[PDB]
Copies of this chain bind each other. A is one copy, B any other.
Amino acid sequence: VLDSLETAAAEAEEADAQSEECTRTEIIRNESIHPEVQIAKNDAPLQYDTNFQVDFITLVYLGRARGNNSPGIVFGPWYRTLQERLVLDRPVAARG
C-alpha cells in the first residue's frame, strides 16, 4: 500500500510539473499557437485537439487492466479481408 501511494504521488507530481511547464511555455509565447488546417480564402481555420493523451491513457489502463470488457469499434473491414487472405495459403488466424 505504501509503495502504491508513493507511485501515485510520484505520477501526480509528474503530471503537475508537466502542466506547470506547459503553462509557463504558454505564458512565454506571445499568443497561444495551435495547429490549423483549412483550404479556402482568408477564413477561420479549424482547431485541432491538444496532443496530451498518452500519459493519461497509460495511467488509466495501468489503474484498470483486468476490467474493460467492451466490444471495441474496428477501423474499417480490414480484419475480414486480412483473415480471408491469410486463410488461403498459410492461415495464422489472429494470434493475439
Contact = CB atoms under 8 A, between A and B. Distances in A.
Interface of A: 9, 12-13, 16, 19-20, 23, 26-27, 30-32
Task: Give the copy number.
Answer: 5
Given A12-B13, A19-B20, A30-B31, 4 more contacts: A9-B9, A19-B23, A20-B23, A23-B26
A9 to B, nearest CB: 7
Contacts of A32: 27
A31 to B, nearest CB: 8
Nearest to A31: B30
Contact of A23 (B13, B23, B30): B23
Most interface-central of A12, A13, A23 (chain B CB within 10 A): A23
Nearest to A13: B12
A19 to B, nearest CB: 7
